[PDB]
């Protein structure tokens, strides 16, 4: 029968909640109550990158912290040199409904995906000097929402069919399939060791997976609505999630519970992108109200505002050396801030 | 600059920024439309009728899980694009906000099916009152008018039970009925049309509008209807920019 299984699930959930409560001796606020605030963080638009016709849906920083790829729904991937705002590449896409993009750690490849349910891997270092589709990965039965290279041969893609997958670009097959989410998977973030990754979905939950094994180690709840963004802490022991309830939350894996809640009464718009600073002290979050907010990740106090985008901020990211913050928005411009 | 490399970069960018300027000229000259409707609405037949306008190159197989379908048709050299969502899940609250800069949403409903007419009204209401589609206007097609006329004429339908307002309803005076048409058919047609119009008029301010049409099964002028509605939308927006409207 189903009633017995429902009761078993309820009992297991109650036991997990009781264990989490027993492990919650002191809040993060109390521990970090006697720390010096970072003050008002002030940034200026160092660079503005233009050239996209429609809204920019995603972007990713290169490992060299200089080049970045941006995807726009006019059907274009543009690889920029943020130092000089010189366009390095402009790849036209087969399908113009692109919702994600990625940059290989070696810089030899880029990836894109979207409403076509297909993850296209583009080789940037061909012997003929042009950029051609190196591979097309198909098998997802829903729109692709995020993709992150593990290396030049492996890639993790989350789709709207409530599943994520680990692929093999050389063969094009699905090496592993991660299931368990009950809603569209909207974001994923890879650990610095690239052994686990966190996926935040539209069922108001995040899950920590195992790339090598293939099962969900831990499930984190606490959000009220869909989770649009997720980002690992620099040391890999925590992660922040931005959601549609206009709040961000910082969870930690070891405690397996939510540590911090970054919210404001003035803010009633959901979070589209979330990223951390190089030291993890600053949490940057993009909002539908056309602004970005820089929070104190340890005190849960707003520290700065990045304004200057005329439409919804859709992507956000921090260089590998932490030297700049890139924000793209639906007004078709990217901004590099310092 | 320092020449050589810094002259190989700013030139390369100026070779991209030119091609982009060639691409923009074709992106701004085409109109993108989003096709919506239920499985019984008849989007497939409509998109088949308007197809005729207009390593393997002509890949006429797609993929078993495609996700999106493209239909390019040209009316008086305007080159409309129509996008119909394919292999997607039942939940549309996330991928439908990517159609926020689109010339028109073509919503087709099976007007002959009163069993799930409230479902059509419900998702029309959801599309209309959306934060990202609140400036996108809807071209409404009330498909399968011949089936509705046959259902009304043959009797044994009792539309009043699905909508308990057909009793206190009178054909709008502005009715423009075909010379051969029973008054009951006209009453039912305009009742469904006004059911959608009461959703459109309520809220919406004046940034987007609704263009309802009656297209039964053999209307070959649906492409011209879309052309006229898109022309009206574009020039209304242009007037709104100049504060003349």
């Amino acid at each position: 029968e189903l009633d017995q299984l429902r009761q078993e699930a309820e009992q297991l959930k109650n036991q997990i909640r009781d264990a989490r409560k027993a492990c919650a001796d002191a809040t993060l606020s109390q521990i970090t109550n006697n720390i010096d605030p970072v003050g008002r963080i002030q940034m200026r638009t160092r660079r503005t990158l233009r050239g996209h016709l429609a809204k920019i849906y995603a972007m990713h920083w290169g490992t060299d912290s200089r080049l970045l790829v941006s995807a726009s729904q006019d059907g274009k991937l543009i690889i920029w040199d943020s130092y000089t705002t010189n366009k390095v590449h402009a790849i036209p896409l087969r399908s113009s409904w692109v919702m994600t993009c990625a940059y290989a750690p070696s810089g030899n490849y880029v990836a894109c995906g979207g409403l076509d349910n297909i993850c296209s891997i583009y080789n940037l270092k061909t012997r003929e000097g042009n950029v051609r589709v190196s591979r097309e990965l198909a098998g997802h039965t829903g729109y692709l929402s995020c993709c992150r290279f593990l290396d030049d041969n492996q890639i993790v893609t989350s789709s709207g069919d409530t599943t994520c997958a680990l692929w093999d670009i050389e063969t094009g097959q699905q090496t592993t399939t991660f299931t368990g989410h009950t809603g569209d998977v909207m974001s994923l973030s890879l650990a610095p060791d690239t052994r686990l990754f966190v996926s935040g979905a539209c069922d108001a939950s995040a899950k920590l997976w195992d790339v090598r094994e293939g099962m969900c180690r831990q499930t984190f709840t606490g959000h009220e609505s869909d989770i649009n963004a997720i980002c690992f802490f620099p040391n890999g022991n925590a992660f922040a999630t931005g959601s549609d309830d206009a709040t961000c939350r910082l969870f930690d894996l070891r405690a397996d519970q939510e540590l911090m809640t970054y919210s404001h009464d003035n803010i009633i718009c959901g979070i589209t992108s979330v990223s951390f600073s190089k030291s993890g002290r600053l949490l940057l979050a993009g909002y539908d109200d056309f602004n970005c907010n820089v929070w104190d990740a340890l005190k849960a106090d707003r520290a700065g505002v990045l304004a200057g985008h005329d439409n919804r901020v859709s992507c956000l990211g921090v260089t590998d050396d932490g030297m700049a913050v890139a924000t793209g928005s639906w007004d078709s411009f990217l901004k590099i801030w310092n | 600059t320092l020449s050589a490399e810094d002259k190989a970069a700013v030139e390369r960018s100026k070779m991209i920024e030119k091609q982009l300027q060639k691409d923009k000229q074709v992106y701004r000259a085409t109109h993108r439309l989003l096709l919506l409707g239920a499985d019984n609405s008849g989007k497939s037949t409509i998109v088949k009728q308007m197809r005729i306008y207009h390593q393997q190159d002509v890949l006429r197989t797609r993929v078993k899980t495609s996700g999106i379908f493209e239909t390019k048709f040209q009316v008086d050299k305007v080159n409309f694009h129509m996008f119909d969502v394919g292999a997607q899940r039942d939940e549309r609250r996330k991928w439908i906000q990517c159609f926020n800069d689109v010339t028109a949403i073509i919503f087709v409903v099976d007007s002959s099916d009163y069993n799930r007419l409230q479902e059509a009204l419900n998702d029309f209401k959801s599309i209309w009152n959306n934060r990202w589609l609140r400036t996108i206007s809807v071209i409404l097609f009330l498909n399968k008018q011949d089936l509705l006329a046959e259902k009304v004429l043959a009797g044994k339908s009792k539309i009043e039970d699905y909508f308990p307002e057909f009793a206190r309803y009178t054909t709008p005076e502005d009715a423009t009925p075909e010379p051969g048409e029973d008054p009951r058919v006209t009453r039912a047609k305009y009742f469904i049309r006004d059911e959608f119009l009461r959703i459109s008029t309520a809220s919406g301010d004046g940034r987007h509008y609704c263009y309802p049409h009656f297209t039964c099964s053999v209307d070959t002028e649906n492409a011209r209807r879309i052309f006229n509605d898109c022309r009206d939308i574009i020039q209304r927006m242009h007037l709104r920019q100049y504060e003349l409207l």
Partner: nanobody, 126 residues
């Protein structure tokens, strides 16, 4: 953790009155627009009624207009549906659904097959 529990379903003779109560937890009740959605046996899910954040805006489907009354208690975090003059065609599984996002008018995917913020349903047989 968003949770919705429905109660008040049971066997009722035709023409009777049944009150369904929905207790919600894990989210701020006052900030969301709530819905009642029924699924008849052998059919799909059908939207029944909806109530706004403040309880001012109320709407019902055609088949239940004049018979069903939907209300919300924000202080008690509860959603009530009173059903009067039950018909045999009203036998269904009733779910207490929630709009996906707060402070919004569009209730997308509430009638979907695998909606997340929906209750597990209560059976009402006439």
């Amino acid at each position: 953790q968003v949770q919705l529990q429905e109660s008040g379903g049971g066997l009722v003779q035709p023409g009777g009155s049944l009150r369904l109560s929905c207790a919600a937890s894990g989210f701020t009740f006052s900030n969301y627009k709530m819905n009642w959605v029924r699924q008849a046996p052998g059919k799909g899910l059908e939207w029944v009624s909806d109530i706004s954040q403040s309880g001012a805006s109320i709407s019902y489907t055609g088949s239940v207009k004049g018979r069903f009354t939907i209300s919300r208690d924000n202080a008690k975090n509860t959603l009530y549906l009173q059903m009067n003059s039950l018909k045999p065609e009203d036998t269904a599984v009733y779910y207490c659904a929630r709009c996906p996002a707060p402070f919004t008018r569009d209730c997308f995917d509430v009638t979907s097959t695998t909606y997340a913020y929906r209750g597990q349903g209560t059976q009402v047989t006439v």
